[PDB]
């Protein structure tokens, strides 16, 4: 499923997305924009034969079980398949874990690269919020 921008911001706020750990909604929407471009089914495989799933592209090495990842842990305690649904719950609950694992939002390479130190409030633009 592909979320329109405001519907996703919407969904995130609802899951207590904004200012969570001092990260404003804007940061989250931006992260998802450049991680998966709002597609819940997005997947990227990594050389180390690990995989990134969902809207926030969580890694199978440490966060979810996709089986196939050699030296893997399942810190969120869920099948990587869970992260590919239409409801955001699973991705947001996991993200919450990852965000406070000692690197803030730096965990997301795309956020880091494309959202960090930018006017993120733009991502919440014309949003009935």
UniProtKB/Swiss-Prot annotation:
* Pfam families in alphabetical order: Lys
Summary of the tissues where the protein is detected = In the egg white and polymorphonuclear leukocytes.
Molecular function via GO: beta-N-acetylglucosaminidase activity; identical protein binding; lysozyme activity
Binding of substrate: at which residues?
101
| Active site per database record | 35, 52
Keyword vocabulary terms for this entry: Allergen, Antimicrobial, Bacteriolytic enzyme, Disulfide bond, Glycosidase, Hydrolase, Secreted, Signal
InterPro entries, A to Z = Glyco_hydro_22, Glyco_hydro_22_CS, Glyco_hydro_22_lys, Lysozyme-like_dom_sf
Q: What is this protein called?
A: Lysozyme C
A GO cellular component annotated for this chain's UniProt record is: extracellular space
Q: Which GO terms describe its biological process?
A: cell wall macromolecule catabolic process; defense response to bacterium; defense response to Gram-negative bacterium; defense response to Gram-positive bacterium; killing of cells of another organism
Q: Does the keyword Secreted apply?
A: yes
Spell out the subcellular localization from the entry.
Secreted
Q: Which Cys pairs are S-S linked?
A: 6-127, 30-115, 64-80, 76-94
Write the Enzyme Commission number(s) for this entry.
3.2.1.17
**Which species expresses this protein natively?**
Gallus gallus
Catalytically driven reaction(s): Hydrolysis of (1->4)-beta-linkages between N-acetylmuramic acid and N-acetyl-D-glucosamine residues in a peptidoglycan and between N-acetyl-D-glucosamine residues in chitodextrins
| Note in the entry | Lysozyme C is capable of both hydrolysis and transglycosylation; it also shows a slight esterase activity. It acts rapidly on both peptide-substituted and unsubstituted peptidoglycan, and slowly on chitin oligosaccharides.
What does the UniProt function comment say about this protein? Lysozymes have primarily a bacteriolytic function; those in tissues and body fluids are associated with the monocyte-macrophage system and enhance the activity of immunoagents. Has bacteriolytic activity against M.luteus.
